[PDB]
Amino acid sequence: EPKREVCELNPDCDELADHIGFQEAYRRFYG
């Protein structure tokens, strides 16, 4: 799952994903 893998390897994205999930985090950072 590209988005989870990518988001995990950005501390701010991983942090955000802890609250809102990786799809929503990835979209905020890499939209």
From Swiss-Prot:
Protein location: Secreted
A Gene Ontology molecular function term of the record: structural constituent of bone
Taxonomic superkingdom: Eukaryota
Residue sites binding Ca(2+) 3 per the record: E8, D14
Chief site of localization: secreted
Sites bearing 4-carboxyglutamate, chain numbering: E1, E5, E8
Residues that bind Ca(2+) 2: E5, E8
GO cellular component: cytoplasm; extracellular region
Domain Gla stretches: 1-31
PTM: Gamma-carboxyglutamate residues are formed by vitamin K dependent carboxylation by GGCX. These residues are essential for the binding of calcium. Decarboxylation promotes the hormone activity.
Binding site for Ca(2+) 1: E1
Disulfide pairings: C7-C13
Annotated keywords: Biomineralization, Calcium, Cleavage on pair of basic residues, Disulfide bond, Gamma-carboxyglutamic acid, Hormone, Hydroxylation, Metal-binding, Secreted, Signal
A Gene Ontology BP annotation from the UniProt entry: brain development
Function: The carboxylated form is one of the main organic components of the bone matrix, which constitutes 1-2% of the total bone protein. It acts as a negative regulator of bone formation and is required to limit bone formation without impairing bone resorption or mineralization. The carboxylated form binds strongly to apatite and calcium. The uncarboxylated form acts as a hormone secreted by osteoblasts, which regulates different cellular processes, such as energy metabolism, male fertility and brain development. Regulates of energy metabolism by acting as a hormone favoring pancreatic beta-cell proliferation, insulin secretion and sensitivity and energy expenditure.
The family this protein is said to belong to: Belongs to the osteocalcin/matrix Gla protein family.
UniProt-recorded name of the protein: Osteocalcin
Organism: Bos taurus (Bovine)
Gene name of the encoded protein: BGLAP
Entire protein: shown range: 68 to 98 of 100
